[PDB]
Amino acid sequence: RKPPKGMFLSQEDVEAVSANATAATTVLRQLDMELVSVKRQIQNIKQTNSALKEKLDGGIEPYRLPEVIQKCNARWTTEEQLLAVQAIRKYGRDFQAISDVIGNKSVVQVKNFFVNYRRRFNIDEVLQEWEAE
């Protein structure tokens, strides 16, 4: 009730090959053509990808910087308050970004800052101007 293992015989394909005397030959050389169309497509893209990889030679090593470590601090200095307000104007509500800028304020203290300095820094109309970009 089933073909032998690895033997392939579909209702669809038999009617195609037996459609006439050369229906077999036709089908098999259409695939031979499609097999050539793709073989050369691969050769083309290999060349294109080879060229792109050549451009990236060196990569980004000449652009990497020492990542200075400084650990969190509870107190907000006037410097750090000012960095934050600017960070908000540029980054909206990306707290992780704002924390990476300031350098010594955890991600939570950023949201604390949002609430604590609610109007002293007019935080709302700052965010409005960000959304306008």
């Binding site: 089933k2 392939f8 015989l9 089908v27 497509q41 910087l65 350098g103």
Partner: protein
């Protein structure tokens, strides 16, 4: 082992093709085993190509993923080159600096950091895709379904199958060619070491046999039969044998002969003649090679020879050595059997030595003493080897061959209960055709039917 396995797998495939997809008719013609086999093989070649195409199509899909990536990595290397320069310039503003300038440095710094590890995530993905590609390019699927060497060895297994059925596979009926497989006998196949003819000779003892007597005409009537025969050594000399009944044992090849070699009077009915036309009568021949010396492996009963071409796959494809004597027995099958009969013994024996020289060495092969070449299709008392289930025929035709003929009444308005013309022989037995034991059994069958009808069956009361 590999090819014999694929051979058997291809046969199973034809059976599936027959039973499951009803691929038994095509163009108002019956499908042969040969047709179905090409179809199966053609779809195995199609699949090999379908897999090749699928494999290369995954590579391009993977390569196009890589190209889209490498394009992003280049447009990101540039954004980074530019942001770096902007950062240096902002860093060169020596402190003390106001907070807008301190921000710029800090802002461009993490902007640069954010992008610098987008590039790293991508260069990670790059390595993955590149490796995924070396894997694919290392593991291509099968290149072809069959090498030229494969097909040749496959053609030999076909020739062996054409030999067994005594006919090209394009003549065999896909649906019915293997009907009598179920009735196969258990045990190992054997040969007769003192000659198979020891059997018919033994059976002949005590019987009245007129040799050199060629029947020319069979007359079967309401009142009895008369058989007209001639001496084969002088065809002018005529004999008339009168009897109550005739048992026809003529080979199917003879019955097929047109114009008739044996005339039936009155003519056989259409249901009989139609069957004779539909049934196949195949052919296969042998070459006997007598030497003075054994130069082959005596422990080997038989060995093969693979043909260069499909066409010549039956040409001397097999050799026998199963007699305590310096005799090799070469076999000719399929389309070769017919064609080889129009070739002289010299040429044929020549090709035999050629093949053998190439196997045992161009020196170890002496010229044979005796040689004999069968030509069964040309034999007028046979006109072939034995019957096969032709495309367009069936097992029922073997039954029609066995049905006796009851001639009508001579006297108008009389009753005609009894038959007069009976049929036996290899071609008349449905479950054991093309065999000696089948001929044997057909004989016993009609002997019992004739006796039942003429002597009466007392055991049925």
């Amino acid at each position: 082992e590999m090819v014999e396995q694929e051979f058997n797998r291809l046969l199973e495939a034809t059976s599936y093709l027959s039973h499951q997809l009803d691929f038994n008719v095509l163009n108002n013609k019956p499908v042969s085993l040969g047709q179905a086999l090409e179809v199966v093989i053609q779809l195995q070649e199609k699949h090999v190509k379908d897999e090749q195409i699928e494999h290369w199509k995954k590579i391009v899909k993977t390569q196009e993923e890589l190209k889209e990536l490498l394009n992003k990595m280049v447009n990101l290397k540039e954004k980074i080159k530019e942001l770096h320069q902007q950062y240096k310039e902002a860093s060169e503003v020596k402190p003390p600096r106001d907070i807008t300038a301190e921000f710029l440095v800090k802002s461009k710094h993490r902007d640069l950091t954010a992008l610098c590890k987008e590039y790293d995530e991508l260069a990670e993905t790059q390595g993955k895709l590149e490796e995924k590609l070396q894997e694919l390019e290392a593991n291509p699927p099968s290149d072809v379904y069959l090498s030229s060497r494969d097909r040749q060895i496959l053609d030999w297994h076909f020739a062996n199958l054409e030999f067994a059925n005594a006919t090209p596979l394009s003549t065999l009926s896909l649906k019915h060619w293997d009907q009598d497989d179920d009735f196969e006998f258990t045990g190992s196949h054997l040969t007769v070491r003192n000659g198979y003819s020891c059997v018919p000779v033994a059976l002949a003892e005590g019987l009245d046999i007129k040799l050199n007597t060629a029947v020319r005409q069979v007359r079967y009537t309401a009142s009895g039969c008369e058989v007209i025969a001639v001496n084969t050594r002088s065809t002018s000399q005529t004999f008339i044998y009168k009897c109550d009944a005739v048992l026809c044992t003529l080979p199917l090849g003879v019955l097929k002969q047109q114009p008739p070699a044996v005339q039936f009077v009155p003519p056989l009915p259409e249901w009989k003649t139609s069957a004779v036309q539909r049934m196949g009568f195949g052919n296969l021949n042998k070459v006997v090679l007598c030497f003075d010396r054994v130069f082959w492996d005596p422990s080997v009963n038989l060995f093969g020879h693979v043909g260069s071409t499909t066409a010549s796959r039956g040409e001397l494809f097999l050799f026998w050595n199963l007699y305590k004597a310096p005799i090799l027995l070469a076999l000719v099958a399929g389309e070769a059997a017919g064609i080889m009969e129009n070739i002289s013994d010299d040429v044929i024996v020549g090709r035999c030595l050629a093949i053998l020289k190439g196997i045992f060495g161009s020196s170890a092969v002496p010229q044979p003493k005796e040689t004999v070449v069968s030509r069964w299709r040309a034999d007028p008392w046979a006109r072939g080897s034995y019957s096969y289930v032709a495309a367009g025929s069936s097992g029922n035709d073997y039954d029609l061959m066995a049905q006796p003929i009851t001639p009508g009444p001579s006297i108008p308005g009389a009753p005609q209960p009894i038959p007069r013309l009976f049929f036996a022989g290899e071609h008349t037995i449905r479950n054991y055709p093309a065999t000696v034991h089948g001929a044997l059994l057909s004989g016993l069958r009609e002997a019992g039917r004739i006796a039942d009808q003429f002597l009466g069956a007392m055991y049925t009361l």
